[PDB]
């Protein structure tokens, strides 16, 4: 069973600009592990599968979180360290294009539909339970968990926002943008690592290591 109440509880429990952004990402990776443990049935997966899902999903999971945290911010993002970063500062640091994609495709769309924390948590749990992740011992089990999340999300949307029949589809259709933005952010991080001019802390660096 996959109650939206548990998914919401998990969200509530865990609540150079590039250098600050990377520092916040390292900090949030620790919190991300604690979040995943609070998602129903994640901790009952084999340890190797928990590792695979987190290594596959961490960037999208963290992007979804900071995007939603930023819904009341004008033209900027709020990092988990408390620092607001405006798009002017991101442009001035050479990451303007990807930052504008975050604002236009994620933050602004979350704001305009007033995406709530239950919906965010369910989208994040869908991302976490990614049955396409390579190396999973039992992909069908992860697929089944994803199916329970989206069934619960749809029921939640139909009950809470009955006047918005397209809302569930609208939520799911931010996932391709999240996927593309995550991939582009990952390219940037690998580049910062290659250049060597941006401090990258130990957990963020481990996520940039090759898989076993």
């Amino acid at each position: 069973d996959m109650p939206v109440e548990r998914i919401l509880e998990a969200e509530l429990a865990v609540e150079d600009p590039v250098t600050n952004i990377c520092q916040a990402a390292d900090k949030q990776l620790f919190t991300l592990v604690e979040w995943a443990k609070r998602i129903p049935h994640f901790s009952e997966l084999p340890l190797d599968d928990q590792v695979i899902l987190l290594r596959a999903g961490w960037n999208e999971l963290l992007i979804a979180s900071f995007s939603h945290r930023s819904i009341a911010v004008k033209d900027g993002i709020l990092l988990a360290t408390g620092l607001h970063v405006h798009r002017n500062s991101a442009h001035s640091a050479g990451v303007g294009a990807i930052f504008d994609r975050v604002l236009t495709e994620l933050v602004s769309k979350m704001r305009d539909m007033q995406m709530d924390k239950t919906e965010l948590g369910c989208l994040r749990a869908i991302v976490l339970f990614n049955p396409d992740s390579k190396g999973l011992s039992n992909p069908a089990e992860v697929e089944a968990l994803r199916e329970k999340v989206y069934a619960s999300l749809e029921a939640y949307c139909k009950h809470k926002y009955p006047e918005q029949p397209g809302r569930f589809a609208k939520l799911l259709l931010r996932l391709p943008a999240l996927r593309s933005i995550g991939l582009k952010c990952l390219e940037h991080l690998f580049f910062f690592k290659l250049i060597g001019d941006t401090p990258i802390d130990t957990f963020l660096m481990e996520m940039l290591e090759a898989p076993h």
Binding site: S43, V51, F203, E206
Partner: peptide, 10 residues
């Protein structure tokens, strides 16, 4: 995966 494994202990 050293840090991640350690943080996933129960």
């Amino acid at each position: 995966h050293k840090i991640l494994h350690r943080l996933l202990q129960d």
